[PDB]
Amino acid sequence: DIQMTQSPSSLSASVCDRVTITCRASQDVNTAVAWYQQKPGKAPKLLIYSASFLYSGVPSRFSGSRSGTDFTLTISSLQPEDFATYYCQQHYTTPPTFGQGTKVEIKRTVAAPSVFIFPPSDEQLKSGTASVVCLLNNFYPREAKVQWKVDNALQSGNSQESVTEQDSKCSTYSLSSTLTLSKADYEKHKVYACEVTHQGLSSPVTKSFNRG
Amino acid sequence: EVQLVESGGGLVQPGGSLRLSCAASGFNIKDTYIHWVRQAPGKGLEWVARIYPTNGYTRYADSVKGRFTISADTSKNTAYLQMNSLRAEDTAVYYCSRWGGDGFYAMDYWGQGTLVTVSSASTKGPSVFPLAPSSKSTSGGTAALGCLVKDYFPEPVTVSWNSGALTSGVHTFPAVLQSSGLYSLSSVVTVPSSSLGTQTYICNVNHKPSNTKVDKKVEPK
The missing domain is CATH 2.60.40.10 (Immunoglobulins)
Incomplete structure (x- = not known):
């Protein structure tokens, strides 16, 4: 109806860096805009109401200004607790319409993973399957690859990569690769390995096992 | 405590229905406007409908109108979303939020969110x-x-x-x-x-x- 066009859709700034998010209203809304912070899989949290006002309890880093139809949330000092998606919302009319959201990530010194290798359970072998885990812990940046070289083979069928969201104190991601194998698959092979080359490493470091 | 607690959100077969409720703690709902906003998975926040409990006057987003119905029971201090004819689009977390009494028309308080999953496939335990x-x-x-x-x-x-x-x-x-x-x-x-x-x-x-x-x-x- 009245659309709020929010930029940018994606961001990366290191601590205390100055941060500006901009939402522009297709029509004049007056002062009838509010700014919100939705942390990973929590509900939205009001930072700023009436365009410029700071919700009680919100830190002073956060600020809001208007330029007629152009609106700005600024964080003077970006803190890692600040990692969220930030939303503008107009409420001058019905419907209330929100921005497409700005997702803020925190640049931190390079930090390499803590690779662990885990086997398929005897109650998992009993269930009649055989799924293997390769846990890269607390590492920055995001980008890396988990190559499973089971009995020295590179199998594109199985690879399933769930990453956690930036930690709110370190801003290291963690990643799980899982080898999808019906027990039939697994019965034969014995040596099993997952290999990783990251921006934290001067060497790809492998973590392997054998059945005993 | 000013608490909103959602319920109702489970799996629904497409064409299905589902009643969502929002519990109100630490304020009376007649005083404010109540809202249902959904957040599809990965996607952004989308408003769904609101209601003035006192007169039961309600407005609705067109993406749902004639399918969803928003209601409340001043008695129990509760608001409900009856969602009919669901499509997999409607697969999303549904938050109820409120409007800070009068002349403070912001969403100061929000529920934890209830997940509606608009799919035919069965409910496998882990x-x-x-x-x-x-x-x-x-x-x-x-x-x-x-x-x-x-x-x-x-x-x-x-x-x-x-x-x-x-x-x-x-x-x-x-x-x-x-x-x-x-x-x-x-x-x-x-x-x-x-x-x-x-x-x-x-x-x-x-x-x-x-x-x-x-x-x-x-x-x-």
């Missing part, structure tokens, strides 16, 4: 299998063990390590959907090599739709 922190998993010392929710539908699973006693270095990985169309994740926690044979390390997976609560311990053998 397998729980513990993790072996062998001699290929120690850092010499501070080493890692875990769990693995193997098969479930629909989202989500509440994993508690030692019933929330254990917090630190608990990474519970986003769910990843399987070739099967069944969800699997992987819950992990880091410990020193010596406290493998000290304390009881137990992730207590809960798949709430499949009223399953399997509490599997992690042993080192």
